[PDB]
Structure 1
Amino acid sequence: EVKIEKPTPEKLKELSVEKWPIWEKEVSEFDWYYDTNETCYILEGKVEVTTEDGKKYVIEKGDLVTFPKGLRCRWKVLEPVRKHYNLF
């Protein structure tokens, strides 16, 4: 379960995501393994994620996304991505 929501302004505010590090990626496709839990706020872009077990999600600008520890998936970056991210 990749969890995805359009966060309220308050939730976003209280997480102080603008202090989180920034990661960017050009159009590309690659496997990823989540060593830790990870929450990402998408500033720009569009990505199709397919998990090891075949589940499919799209994440795009304005989404708050949480990836669980131990998830193996493949990212397909369709529009260049910019995000704030917090490992936990």
Structure 2
Amino acid sequence: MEVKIEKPTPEKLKELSVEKWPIWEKEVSEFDWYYDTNETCYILEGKVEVTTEDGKKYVIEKGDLVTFPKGLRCRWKVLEPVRKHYNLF
């Protein structure tokens, strides 16, 4: 697995300028996640607790980007209004 948890700082965000990337708005719902491409997303406002079938867990809240491998299948669940940017290949 290649899932990393990091919160880009104003310095790193400059090059990671998510402002140019689309935006997603979501309420504290619950969604099933199935990967299909080396994608990258950045949190801008929200709380999500990810639990993979393999037995892993990715907690990303406010300004946090994580990587995922093609095929990754895990359940997503927002705790508070979620706003994140995208970066898919």
Same fold (TM over 0.5): yes
Q: Which runs of 5+ in 2 are unaligned?
A: none
Aligned residues with identical type, % of pairs: 100
Flag the structure with higher strand content.
1
Deviation of 1:54 after TM superposition, in Å, equals 2.1
CA RMSD after TM alignment: 1.3
Could you say what secondary structure the match of 1:11 adopts?
helix
- Structure 2 matches for 1:35-46, cutoff 5 A? 35-46=36-47
**C-alpha distance in structure 2 between counterparts of 1:64 and 1:9, whole Å:** 13
Could you say what secondary structure the match of 1:4 adopts?
coil
Could you tell me the TM-score, scaled by structure 1's length?
A: 0.89
Deviation of 1:44 after TM superposition, in Å, equals 0.3
Give the count of matched residue pairs.
Answer: 88
**C-alpha distance in structure 2 between counterparts of 1:76 and 1:54, whole Å:** 16
Could you say what secondary structure the match of 2:12 adopts?
helix
Deviating 4+ runs (over 4 angstroms): none
**C-alpha distance in structure 2 between counterparts of 1:26 and 1:67, whole Å:** 23
